């Protein structure tokens, strides 16, 4: 169970190129299930029902009171 369950914010909008990638939009919230190689991270949408791959250089890990 390699999952961290860390939320993240969408800094910029991104579109998937494969049939296994997830879409992203500036201001959109996502949950990074776990980091993956190739510079791709598996995250899910807000609905929590849609999961896929998202860019790491396009999102920003959110924290409760840390930086």
């Amino acid at each position: 169970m390699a999952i961290v369950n860390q939320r993240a914010v969408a800094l910029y909008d991104f579109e998937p190129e494969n049939d296994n990638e997830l879409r992203l939009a500036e201001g959109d919230i996502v949950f990074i299930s776990y980091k993956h190689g190739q510079g791709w991270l598996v995250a899910e949408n807000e609905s929590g029902s849609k999961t896929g791959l998202v860019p790491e250089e396009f999102v920003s890990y959110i924290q409760p009171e840390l930086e």
């Binding site: 993956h36 896929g52 791959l53 860019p55 790491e56 250089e57």
Partner: peptide, 16 residues
């Protein structure tokens, strides 16, 4: 695993 990306991730803009 289910997902399997095979390509270089994009890059952010310069403005922001």
């Amino acid at each position: 695993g289910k997902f399997i990306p095979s390509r270089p991730a994009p890059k952010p803009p310069s403005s922001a």
